[PDB]
Amino acid sequence: FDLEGYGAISRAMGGTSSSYYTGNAALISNPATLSFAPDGNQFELGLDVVTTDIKVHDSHGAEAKSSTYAVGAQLSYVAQLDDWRFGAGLFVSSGLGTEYGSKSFLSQTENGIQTSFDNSSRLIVLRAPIGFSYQATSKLTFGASVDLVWTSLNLELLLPSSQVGALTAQGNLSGGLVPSLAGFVGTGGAAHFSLSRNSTAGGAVDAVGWGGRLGLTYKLTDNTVLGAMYNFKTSVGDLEGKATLSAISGDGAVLPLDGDIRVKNFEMPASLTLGLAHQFNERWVVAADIKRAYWGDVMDSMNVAFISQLGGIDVALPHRYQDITVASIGTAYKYNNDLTLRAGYSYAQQALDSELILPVIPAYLKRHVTFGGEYDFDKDSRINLAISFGLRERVQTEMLRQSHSQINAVVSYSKNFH
């Protein structure tokens, strides 16, 4: 979602972030970094663009071709008040997700009828940090940040009867409606969710949250820095909106019901990263961070409740223990006095599998490989660059094979106010 450091610049160097100037994006990173910022007041201005490519194939020529793009932004201004550095920003990750069309084997009944229903998802995060960085000694900086959050989810899932069957079997599905139209669907049917309503005026199924953050740094040597930060599991609230469940019979008939979803305990990971920035040269600077996503850490259940005039349906997915580890290294050579060149590789590696291959919910990529530079044309104006690579992956276990990749591409601009 954003466990990739973030920063037009912190993206260029493998996602590294913990101990070196990473731009104003250190507000959602390590706010202690903001103390390595030029004097006066930096004003960052970022524009993100991701595209994503998913191929799903199984039981012969299953042909699910998704290929969306998303687009984010960055409006930030970190201001220096002596040893204090105050700052705030707006950050966007809008359009992220999937779209398969209503032509897919994903849009065929469990018995195999081509439905007109769509398979697609799209999320919109809206972080808004208020942060500070505090210079303390000639060797140690500290920073915190707190952010209001706002998420918006539209999605068009379809579940071939047997999946629903498995969900009732597990004890995860329930509700008035399950008995009632079990026979209308019938083994060989399918139910289909559609929370659309992107008109936020409607319901949209959206929520407000609160993230947190704080970190530090140590100049162990004069040519070596020592970063650490703990992102808090962001307390997202309930996603309440308006959706439309639609059961589908063996021969292709459709009952459209209209109600309200309430998604509960969408667990976001707390994370703790550590690393360093050795500088054995006045061009060659190199960063290396390890990150540990404190993932599954509460013993709740994500609870999706659909309530209609005709009764409720309800799904409860437990919070399995889980966690990931992103080893990220990055590099920035100074070709000249106006030019830095960055590159980075990073390898995430999660444990305990959790291989619930959800086509409409893409999975985090392990190997990333990123490049990028910087260029000055004003010295009080400045402009950063990055591109990263989601490296080819296979994941598969109903039987389903999926193979997908991602490709981020950022820009930002800092007009400095001395």
Author numbering: 4 to 400, 408 to 428
Study text:
Thus far, only the FadL OM channel family has been shown to mediate transport of hydrophobics. PpF1 has three FadL orthologs, of which TodX (Pput_2883) and CymD (Pput_2901) are located in the adjacent tod and cym/cmt operons respectively. Here we show, by using an integrated approach combining growth assays, X-ray crystallography and molecular dynamics (MD) simulations, that MAH uptake as the first step in biodegradation does occur via lateral diffusion. In the presence of TodX/CymD, robust growth is observed, providing the first direct evidence for MAH transport by FadL-type channels.
We therefore opted to use the same strategy for TodX and CymD, and reasoned that a lack of growth on MAH after closing the lateral opening would provide strong evidence for a lateral diffusion mechanism. The lateral opening in TodX involves both β-strand S2 and S3, contrasting with EcFadL in which only strand S3 is involved. Strand S2 in TodX bulges outward, whereas S3 has a less pronounced kink in the same place as EcFadL. To flatten the S2 bulge, we removed seven residues that were not visible in the density of TodX, replaced a proline with alanine and inserted an alanine to connect the strands (ΔS2). We determined the X-ray crystal structures of both TodX variants which showed that, as expected, the size of the lateral opening is drastically reduced as a result of the flattening of the strands, while the remainder of the mutant structures are very similar to those of wild type. The two TodX mutant channels ΔS2 and ΔS2S3 have much smaller lateral openings, while retaining overall high structural similarity to the wild-type protein. Plate growth assays with vapour-phase toluene showed background growth for the TodX and CymD lateral opening mutants, indicating that they are defective in toluene uptake. For TodX, background growth is already observed for the ΔS2 mutant, so the effect of the additional flattening of strand S3 in the ΔS2S3 variant cannot be assessed.
